[PDB]
Design a protein around this ligand. Structure first.
Ligand SMILES: [Cl-]
Lengths: 470, 467
């Protein structure tokens, strides 16, 4: 490992046009000093492999604002108006990549695996192609993503994804010893770890350079062999995107929140989406133990931090400062998604704009109105073994159906939803039997459900009035 | 995580014919207790996925002695006479699997990856098929391995290896916290970590259960979500297969091999001469030795007090690590190797072809212990592969020849050959180039001890020898 004292010296040789892996998830784990240096070198036209787009004035956002980036390979790019201006204006190329796929392709890139198969994105634009990479002002797609090869394995459909390997990786890490061994802090690891093994030249900025021996050899996140250039970052602002602090909705939403709260079981491993699902976790019995997995690489999310617990290195997938409970673990983004795709999470519960009779889900894109990427959603619904539960208002305004024979909006996955909870009904979803109404909100009739549902459903002989967590 | 107090209880539901992933590298990180429990359940016809089969009377060897294993899916038999005996006799079925591939397939097994490509095995019996899986009592082959699909990516050939998922995984770990989180010690991690995410039911035995909070969240090697059943091991014998403590033409090869080392180099030294050549490295030079079983920073043999059964080198010998070393899982280790992150791979060979083919793992009906990590170690073009070996075999039979006659380890993967008589550079296209020649010997001498033509370096020098 070569050590530098000046951030600019370590990145001075990044070529214009370089593919640079930029660590970070939201504003967490971002190499702000290496980004600052690229600001000073002015290296142009980069292909930034970065999970998110930081925000307007931080992280990748700073390089977007100075227009140093030509292409983003990311999973979620909301909260950056300049990014959205560039993307919508057609000034920026963006490959919306399933977070888990991004993590795994990066890993493959450092592990000598040219390509591998995954269930994520099967039956969506990722597999089908057509995801907009570069737009024209007019709203039409200039560059469309290409399909991924589909292949059958053990009766299921997977798609071939290829390794991502950068010219440089700008890695934000916590510490490095003088040998070049590196470790990451809390959820700040996310993509930094796998990115550090997947570039011709990896550049790591650390908050601290420490002596050799500082680390237990078993606990070196990234072995010195992967660390080519190491610099101690000069300035750390550690911006916090969404300060969510706790101190010591309407009835429709309240009702969905209260029924979803009933999906939790003890010892359950669950991943909860932003909004209602996370809120439903608020109604988990103190008697029940539910381990919340955060795709940004956390197992054991806790409630929002008290003012004194606020930590820019610890945020949930919703990018809110969080805490973790006892016995929690942090892992890289690639491990997180191996855990998710492998079906290790028992329950995944998320919002949706549409759900189909047999489990298709649509919750990441609204052609022309909502194009911020799918984050980890396609990976979350990719495993047959994980029970996926959708929580959403039953119908759209003017009673337009959200539950239908088939979704009209871009799919997050196919035959992946196992249950839907609305304020009027609870349906079990089976890829073979279809929709089965198993709960009906009191006051409403099966007929009321029929005129607010766009497909038919079996009515379970065990159909009960809709429950609410107490 | 469900905690058990009795190992039999934790595995009594394994059916006969179940595929079971068994952690361990040689005798390091083996699930002695879970294996002992299987001796009791008497579950038979097992397909055991394990790097090695331990030794004759320990580790997986026990289930071989008891004929409870119908089939081993391993990378190296090693010094297990019975394992070898059974394989050659036509009793035990064995899929010799490249160690690095064994590891990546297990990881894929828990990561939702049904299959992935790797360069390891390309051009060998692994990719081609024909690797004997099961022998006929009369020496012939009853079951041969099937061929793996080949696919090219970015100018290179790779083979398709499918995920390995077990019905059960018998995993050895160092500690578990009360929540189910698990950590490994030194090199005993090896295959235990990935096998722990790739089975319908993982059964982890630890040497210790600690309190939740005992681990720093960032340092839990195996998050609780993956540990279905956890039991604290009843008995740990800490057996050590090879106790290597510390207190000539072969030497010519070693002394020249020692000159391949450069400062800041990351290297993987094969058994014998290569490992020996590392003794001649200048203290003023920093060379980092990577061990396939999951170590970076190998040190010298341990003094008596330094001996640790959880820290052995690839040759199954007790070793130490130098400051700033690291440990990581077998799949990580091979991600590291397969990823070309190791600068120098130096190993022995029975044969090397004109263009770099290497044959170092099999000899029909006599050498059938498997390839170990060798096919993986020579799989990366970015890594410099140096073969150190005696120039000729008994009766001056050639070892450097046009085409190897022995099963290949790698196709066009050798960059240089150091023998006692010469040093040749090897190019996958132009062939051999004698760049160094032992004094007192002539190019004619070399000519008659080499089965094929070679170029002579216009700057050929007497063969150097580390001082
Ligand atoms: Cl081995």
């Amino acid at each position: 490992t070569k050590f530098y004292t000046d951030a600019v010296e370590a990145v001075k040789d990044i070529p214009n046009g370089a593919t640079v892996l930029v660590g970070g998830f939201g504003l967490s784990g971002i190499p702000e000093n290496l980004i600052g240096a690229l600001l000073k070198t002015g290296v142009k036209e980069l292909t930034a492999v970065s999970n998110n787009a930081g925000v307007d004035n931080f992280g990748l956002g700073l390089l977007l604002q100075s227009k140093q980036i030509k292409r983003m390979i990311s999973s979620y790019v909301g909260e950056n108006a300049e990014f959205e201006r560039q993307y919508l204006a057609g000034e920026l190329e963006v490959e919306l990549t399933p977070q888990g796929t991004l993590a795994e392709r990066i890993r493959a890139g450092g592990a000598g695996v040219p390509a591998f198969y995954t269930s994520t994105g099967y039956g969506t634009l990722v597999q089908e192609g057509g995801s907009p990479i570069k737009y024209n002002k007019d709203g039409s797609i200039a560059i469309a993503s290409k399909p991924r090869e589909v292949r059958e394995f053990n009766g299921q459909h997977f798609i071939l994804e290829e390794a991502i390997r950068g010219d440089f990786a700008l890695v934000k890490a916590w510490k490095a010893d003088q040998a070049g061994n590196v470790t990451f802090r809390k959820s700040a690891r996310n993509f930094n770890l796998p990115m550090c093994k997947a570039a011709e030249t990896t550049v790591v900025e650390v908050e601290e350079i420490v002596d050799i021996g500082s680390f237990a050899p078993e606990d070196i996140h990234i072995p010195k062999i992967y660390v080519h250039r190491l610099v101690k970052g000069e300035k750390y602002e550690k911006r916090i995107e969404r300060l969510s602090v706790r101190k010591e909705g309407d009835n429709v939403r309240e009702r969905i929140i209260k029924r979803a709260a009933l999906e939790f079981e003890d010892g359950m491993y669950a991943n909860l989406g932003i909004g209602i699902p996370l809120l439903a976790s608020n109604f988990i019995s103190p008697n029940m133990t539910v381990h919340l997995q955060s795709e940004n690489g956390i197992l054991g999310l806790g409630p929002y931090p008290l003012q004194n617990e606020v930590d820019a290195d610890l945020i949930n997938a919703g990018k809110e400062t969080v805490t973790v409970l006892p016995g929690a673990s942090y892992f890289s983004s690639d491990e997180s998604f191996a855990m998710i795709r492998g079906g290790h999470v028992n329950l995944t519960m998320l919002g949706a704009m549409q759900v189909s009779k047999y489990g298709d889900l649509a919750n990441w894109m609204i052609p022309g109105k909502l194009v911020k990427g799918m984050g980890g959603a396609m990976d979350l619904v990719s495993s047959a073994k994980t029970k996926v539960v959708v929580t959403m208002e039953h119908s759209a305004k003017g009673n337009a159906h959200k539950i239908m024979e088939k979704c009209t909006l871009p799919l997050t996955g196919k035959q992946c939803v196992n249950r839907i909870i609305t304020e009027k009904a609870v349906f079990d979803v089976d890829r073979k039997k279809g929709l089965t109404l198993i709960e009906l909100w009191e006051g409403l009739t099966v007929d009321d459900i029929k005129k607010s549902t766009g497909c038919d459903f079996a009515v379970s002989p065990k159909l009960i009035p809709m429950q609410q967590v107490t």
